[PDB]
From a paper:
It is composed of the Ufd1/Npl4 dimer adaptor, which determines substrate specificity, and the Cdc48 hexamer, a AAA+ protein that couples adenosine triphosphate (ATP) hydrolysis to protein unfolding. S. cerevisiae Ufd1/Npl4/Cdc48 was prepared and incubated in the presence of 1S1UH-mEOS and ATP·Mg and analyzed by single-particle cryo-electron microscopy. More than 700k particles from three datasets were combined and segregated by 3D classification into three major classes of the Ufd1/Npl4/Cdc48 complex: no ubiquitin nor substrate-bound (“substrate-unbound”), bound to substrate prior to unfolding (“substrate-interacting”), or bound to substrate and unfolding a ubiquitin (“ubiquitin-unfolded”).
Other major differences observed between resolved substrate-interacting and ubiquitin-unfolded classes are the orientation of the tower relative to Cdc48 and the positioning of Npl4 residues 437 to 451, which forms a loop atop the Cdc48 central pore where substrate enters the hexamer during unfolding. In unbound and substrate-bound states, this loop is positioned over the central pore where it could clash with substrate as its being unfolded. In ubiquitin-unfolded states, the Npl4 tower appears perpendicular to the hexamer plane, but in unbound and substrate-bound states, the Ufd1/Npl4 tower tilts back and away from the Cdc48 central pore. Interactions between SUMO and Ufd1 could not be resolved in EM maps, perhaps because the SIM is connected to Ufd1 through an extended and presumably disordered linker (last structured Ufd1 residue observed is amino acid 311; Ufd1 SIM is residues 357 to 361).
Author numbering:
A (entry chain G): 107 to 386
B (entry chain B): 21 to 29, 71 to 75, 207 to 594, 608 to 719, 749 to 789
C (entry chain C): 71 to 75, 206 to 594, 608 to 719, 749 to 790
The structure:
């Protein structure tokens, strides 16, 4: 019986996969049974239990627990299938080669190679659950850049992933240092040549890997000091207005697509890059 | 003549894209209609501008499954070379709630955006069944969306919609109105020539043996649809390989090339495949073509002349009827003892005017009377209109007309177009049992009595039934014809069948003993010894009395 | 070695017995397209893709599919019906799509859709939005994979009428396979397969168990073996100490299943295969049917010749007869004639008794006439037998029967035999040419026939040495086979009563002549003279109706 493919994934992913994450519960006062046995209110709570999260004020379910829930729901053992892969990243591009009796899309199309209507809906799980800065100086210097110059900034943050016990099967990205590419920051925004950025970052990443680090996100500042005598900034981003504008959402999506998360439960072998974006 | 004026003249403008007119056979008239409705509006759109009309667009093909509706649609689309959008019923209906409508919207929008286009909605009965079957609200949203898209298209032009379904009634009635699927095409089971053409089309890549008689297979296969013939060929090839399996080593990965080079399908394999095949086209009412002349029927010369005057002149010479302002009769009613050859008369009439033939036996009428059939009287007459000229033969009419079904028949027959050549012929062994309503003018009011065959008629019948069976050279049937006074055609058929049974028994015994390649007169005598008249004298007297009453009442 | 080398991937052709015909069909339809695709390339055809197995539950359809898949070495992709239909809204369709796509991606493959009747039930059985979306998805997947892939789809269902009709046409499950109840040899093979790891005792007579189990599907035999083992455990429980958590190996070594346990298990079994119409094998020759020699010759020349010498029929251009109608007093042995006819041409046998037809008339059965004839087609050559046809042929059921008789392919070797006690009461429409046109009268047995019946019925009873039955045969003039069977049964009952009395008093190994005398003292003819005269008059009129 075919199973997960043979592909190397991060140590954190493996050690998370080893664990079970069940949350034990003690004898409820509504139980009707002796010491041995358990009815419905005493059974261990699955790591993806929505009631537990909403009771503990957690807004997403720690992707590995989402994978656990999918595996539990599907893929019966010893029969009933040949291990349908549970994870499959969405793909909306049209099937340029259908030839179900018709030429390619530009001059013919059938109901089989026609992208179906897309239904947006808030995602219920998050890959990386926490982001931790080893020292305050890492961001203090980043903000000192703006303090001295007055323009905005932008830089990649290097580090590594590890476990996070405060959430069921959660992951935290620990950031050790920040690297700032050559960019032309401006009063209301910033610009940066893409080709120079990637050409430099290739060798920077080689050196960082030799040092043991990895590129795990990007951070930029959006600050406009108020006129008050003290040092204060306007609250431009809040509940009723935008959190991340459309342009930065698009850039984050591109960055995530360019840093795939190698996974063993998807046909392609990757799913939903572990790449975070921070804003000040 | 004019009807197939579009069929006359690299290939395919040079997968499932390779289908072309050369991959179809036995549907010349329907193919002509479909091409005339599709190519002209798109390939030569200036004709209708010159003459000042808007050509109709909606085309609704229907027939038994396997008749080649999808094949015809795809062949026409690939030969026209126009933007072809294919919509599948189940494929659209398998989408989530709210997506099966957006798919249709985008399909029509794209077909309108691009150059002259063809939209083929295969299996439209899935996305727009009859209202009583449209359970749920999504089943109504989809139907309403289809109707709106169909209505909003009439202005665009240079876009033709083709739909296919099994039965005319399976579709929502609202889809068959002006500006919608108004033109209707009916695909019927092919005739002998059509079956031969299909057989040649399919068996063009097989390693046929030299002893293959595709004409014989065409003759034997009656009621076989194109899909049935394809299955026949596939099963014959499977039988051939099964026979050759002895020389093949299944365990070994590779098979010897020499063995693969000796594969050949023999006529015996085709006979075996015929034995295995089970067609289902005739289980439902279908439009079929018949080729009975005034020679498979013996005697009844006066009745033949009466039928000719009744049917042929209206069809062949409508100008004279218009000149005299007299409209032709709609229906006829045969009555007489069973086995007198009424079905043969109906088929001969249909063949004389070269019309299609629809037959509705007694079991079908009873099934409709019990409401456990897919079709219905309205559906039968819709098919008759779509396939006109047509002859609708209602056999065993007395079973139901001893009613809801008779009321439906009266409604449909009254609503029939006077100038449209759709004749109705009813058959009944008990004319008095027939409801008097059906026999009023404008309905099956012309009654004809079909008597038992006479001496010469019996001789002709016996010769016709025995023609395709080997017999002793210098064999006389005059004595058999003379001695069987009062026998109907069925009794003579029984006599000849018993003679053949005796002959085959003797042949098998002789072969087992180890001769009898004929049917000697002793076999005929032995078979005749156990044959008797199937019509009691009382019934013959009753029929004669009814005929005398009719003659007296009309003179 | 074998199998191209508990863990259902460990089943092969050696774990299936008694279904060699259907196994051969499935193998030629699955292995050949996959193992040797070059044959169909050379012949220039596309092999059929779909296959649809059906039969009573417990007949080993899943076992056959698994065995074929494992032996082929292809990429098996079992799909369950209940498993797929337990998913949330919009997830079952996704599972179907992913299964088909994966099977097509790793060709050659074998998709096995187990219990398809739950995914695509009859159109009137769904009535739900999801139940229609799933069916449409399945149809789309079946159509899409018709070409463009070297994949084979296999499905299993209880009855042909339990599936949406749209799935049984060209480009879809266009091949049908019918699984029937096994015969004596098949049951023996199944018993040998199951009872190979058990600690059978020396006194085991698997042949006897196979003989005593009729209508037992493989599941019933497995349950029988389990029950016998449990009975053995119960019997040995006296030496087992329930309190202790360990049992001496000496006691375990003494376990052994004996014939008594198997007899008990036979007593406590609930087979259900025969509660519905089922195809079955028959082994009656022209020797159990004493007398009726002329009727035997008529049946031979009516049935055997078309089946065994079709070339002669084609040469003479004669179409073989479809069916016949037996009539006569009850108990004359019509079912024996039907079974003998089926046996001679080595055809299957479907029996539809009066209660089943009445249930169909009341519309409270899981099977229809169309279903019966679909099974008959799939299992051809077949003999369908409508017993006591006069209950329904006194109707929509009769109309359906006529429709099916008209529909059936002439060249197909499917023969319909009808039995009735009131030939006049039968609907005339059934007797037209192209239907049950032939009428055969089965009279009461004669003296020699009666003696033959008596001898046949006593081959399983310890009769007294030197016993005679000519006097009994002569004394029973006018008796049918049922009456003679009743006489024998009463004699056996008296003998067993006397044996039990003697044992209780404490001998009586075999029946004696006085037992038969006592049993015959209460003999009574089951056919009144008036009814016999009526049947004779009807036969005489029929002969006159076929006069010169
Ligand atoms: N003249 C013909 N008429 C019909 N079928 C033909 C003919 N020639 C070849 N065929 C073959 O017969 C089969 C007909 O299948 P087809 O899909 O056209 O049938 P259908 O029932 O009309 O279609 P659908 O239900 O998909 O709309 C195909 O194998 C086609 O190749
Ligand atoms: N030749 C055989 N025929 C039938 N059953 C057999 C045979 N040999 C063994 N068996 C046993 O019979 C049972 C087979 O049950 P199985 O699940 O295959 O039947 P089914 O009702 O057709 O399947 P399903 O419900 O999965 O569609 C198993 O116990 C198997 O061990
Ligand atoms: N002139 C004829 N009169 C009667 N039967 C004929 C004649 N010629 C042929 N037959 C045979 O009659 C049979 C068909 O009879 P049919 O037309 O069904 O009679 P009915 O309509 O009374 O049922 C066929 O076997 C056909 O060959
Ligand atoms: N030649 C025979 N004629 C009649 N009954 C026979 C004959 N041989 C055996 N029997 C017995 O007849 C019984 C079955 O009779 P059956 O065939 O059901 O009669 P029917 O078909 O008239 O109802 C069995 O017990 C069988 O042993
Ligand atoms: Zn509890
Ligand atoms: Zn496509």
């Amino acid at each position: 019986r075919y199973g997960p493919l043979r592909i190397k994934e991060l140590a954190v992913d493996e050690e998370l996969e080893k664990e079970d994450g069940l949350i034990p519960r003690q004898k409820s006062k509504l139980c009707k049974h002796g010491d041995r046995g358990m009815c419905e209110y005493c059974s261990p709570l699955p790591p993806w239990d929505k009631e537990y999260h909403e009771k503990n004020k957690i807004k997403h379910i720690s992707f590995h627990s989402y994978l656990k829930k999918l595996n539990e729901n599907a893929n019966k053992k010893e029969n009933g299938s040949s291990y349908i892969s549970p994870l499959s990243e969405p793909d909306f591009r049209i099937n340029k080669r259908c030839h179900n009796g018709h030429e390619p899309w530009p001059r013919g199309i059938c109901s089989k190679c026609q992208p179906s209507a897309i239904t947006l809906q808030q995602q219920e799980f998050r890959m990386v659950d926490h982001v931790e800065f080893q020292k305050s100086e890492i961001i203090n210097e980043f903000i000192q850049a703006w303090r001295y110059t007055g323009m905005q900034r932008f830089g990649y943050m290097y580090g590594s992933y590890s476990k996070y016990d405060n959430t069921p099967l959660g992951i935290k990205a620990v950031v050790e240092a920040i690297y700032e590419p050559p960019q032309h920051d401006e009063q209301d925004g910033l610009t940066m040549d893409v080709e120079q950025v990637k050409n430099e970052m290739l060798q920077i990443d080689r050196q960082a890997q030799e040092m043991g680090l990895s590129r795990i996100g990007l951070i930029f500042t959006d600050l406009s000091d108020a006129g008050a005598g003290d040092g204060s900034v306007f609250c431009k981003r809040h509940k009723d207005s935008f959190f991340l504008s459309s342009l930065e959402v698009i850039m984050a999506a591109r960055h995530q697509t360019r840093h795939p998360n190698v996974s063993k439960y998807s046909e392609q072998g990757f799913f939903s890059s572990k790449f975070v974006t921070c804003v000040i | 003549k004019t009807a197939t004026a579009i069929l006359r003249r690299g290939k395919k403008r040079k997968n499932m894209n390779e289908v072309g007119y050369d991959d179809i056979g036995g549907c010349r008239k329907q193919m002509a209609q479909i091409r005339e409705m599709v190519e002209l509006p798109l390939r030569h759109p200036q004709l209708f501008k010159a003459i000042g009309i808007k050509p109709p667009r909606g085309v609704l093909m229907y027939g038994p499954p396997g008749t080649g509706k999808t094949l015809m649609a795809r062949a026409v689309a690939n030969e026209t070379g126009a933007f072809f959008f294919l919509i599948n019923g189940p494929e659209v209906m398998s989408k989530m709630a709210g997506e099966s409508e957006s798919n249709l919207r985008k399909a029509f929008e794209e077909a309108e955006k691009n150059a002259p286009a063809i939209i083929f909605i295969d299996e439209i009965d899935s996305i727009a069944p009859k209202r009583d079957k449209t359970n749920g609200e999504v089943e109504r949203r989809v139907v309403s969306q289809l109707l709106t898209l169909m209505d909003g298209m009439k202005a665009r032009s240079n876009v033709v919609v083709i739909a296919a379904t099994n039965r005319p009634n399976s579709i929502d009635p609202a889809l068959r109105r002006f500006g919608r699927f108004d033109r209707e095409v009916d695909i019927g089971i092919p005739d002998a020539t059509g079956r031969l053409e299909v057989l040649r089309i399919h068996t063009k890549n097989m390693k046929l043996a030299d002893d293959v008689d595709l004409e014989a297979l065409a003759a034997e296969t009656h009621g076989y649809v194109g899909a049935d013939i394809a299955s026949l060929c596939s099963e014959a090839a499977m039988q051939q390989i099964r026979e050759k399996m002895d020389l093949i080593d299944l365990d070994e990965d590779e098979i010897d090339a020499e063995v693969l080079d000796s594969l050949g399908v023999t006529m015996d394999n085709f006979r075996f495949a015929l034995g295995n095949s089970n067609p289902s086209a005739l289980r439902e009412t279908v439009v079929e073509s018949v080729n009975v002349t005034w020679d498979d029927v013996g005697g009844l010369d006066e009745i033949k002349e009466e039928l000719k005057e009744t049917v042929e002149y209206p069809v062949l010479h409508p100008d004279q009827y218009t000149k005299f302002g007299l409209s032709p009769s709609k229906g006829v009613l045969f009555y007489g003892p069973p086995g007198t050859g009424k079905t043969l008369l109906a088929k001969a009439v249909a063949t004389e005017v070269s019309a299609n033939f629809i037959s509705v036996k007694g079991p079908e009428l009873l099934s409709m009377w019990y409401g456990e059939s897919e079709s219905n009287i309205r559906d039968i007459f819709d098919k008759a209109r779509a396939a006109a000229p047509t002859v609708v033969f209602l056999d065993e009419l007395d079973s139901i007309a001893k009613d809801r079904v008779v009321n439906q028949l009266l409604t449909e027959m009254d609503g029939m177009n006077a100038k449209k050549n759709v004749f109705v012929i009813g058959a009944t062994n008990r004319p008095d049992q027939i409801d008097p309503a059906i026999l009023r003018p404008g309905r099956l009011d012309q009654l004809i009595y079909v008597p038992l065959p006479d001496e010469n008629a019996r001789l002709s019948i016996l010769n016709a039934q025995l023609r395709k069976t080997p017999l002793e050279p210098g064999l006389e049937l005059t004595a058999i014809a003379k001695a069987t006074q009062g026998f109907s055609g069925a009794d003579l058929l029984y006599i000849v069948q018993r003679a053949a049974k005796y002959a085959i028994k003797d042949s098998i015994e002789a072969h087992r003993q180890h001769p009898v390649p004929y049917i000697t007169k002793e076999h005929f005598a032995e078979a005749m010894k156990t044959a008797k008249r199937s019509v009691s004298d009382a019934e013959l007297r009753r029929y004669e009395a009814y005929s005398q009453q009719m003659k007296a009442s009309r003179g």
